[PDB]
């Protein structure tokens, strides 16, 4: 038991173009997290398809996706980590692995849903790594994965979306999550991502079919709002006839201390209230900035990941949060996607909404709270 607040946020001026209507139509998204995104080295098993269930514990079925669709989500993001499923010098994706993803994509297409696929946890020297020392290999990798991926889904309609990569950053470095634009290693990465996103777009468009007119999502550094807001960030060019088809990809588990920060750290909070200037602040802050630079100039933005972890049964707070977040975004013309990883209890990051093994919504209160301000 938890009550859904009434959110009074002034609806803002949203330009009337194909892109923003497209994004509006996505309504709201649902991430199939801890699933195909799972990545780790030296598996001790022989079936690579077990990567699908290593972090969620259950194989995906069409009835799940059905359940997600009836609940009101019109988008499903299917994050993919590919690096554990390639061989050879030009990164050949396993047929079994690519087949299995397609099966799950067809689950959603059959549900007339919007679908997002990407490169996820492949951020790593030798695969995707945004700096000059590894650009040489990264371009080949972005090129190879996407030629393969875009070619198989060549004939799928515009309801299918390609997201270049999830949270590209300098892993292992002291700037992994934060940038010093005064530090040259940082400036190099931002430039490197601009390059890799452009390779991404060129590659997809070159494979023909409906990939020439498909909506593509691209992130800034670390998928942070900040690093698409900086001047250095470049929206990739398309010499094609299909205009305004690049969407800004951002992630924001904000306010951090409530949404994402672990409960055993001292600056965590379990409370969130719409009546608190403090709880609303960071949401207003970053969303205003994305709207000023992008949406308001006709350029589409999508929040691909967001959510709030369960902290010992703080349902009411998560409800007011979800409702406020989705409204604040919709009022600014932005569609969001919850990160649902089928995790509900324990000291892990419990972002679960749908018990996948029973098909019952553990927190329908949170879902309804989102559906209320999502159209």
TrEMBL record:
It comes from the Bacteria. This is Beta-1,3-1,4-glucanase. It comes from Caldicellulosiruptor sp. F32. The lineage of its organism: Bacteria, Bacillati, Bacillota, Bacillota incertae sedis, Caldicellulosiruptorales.
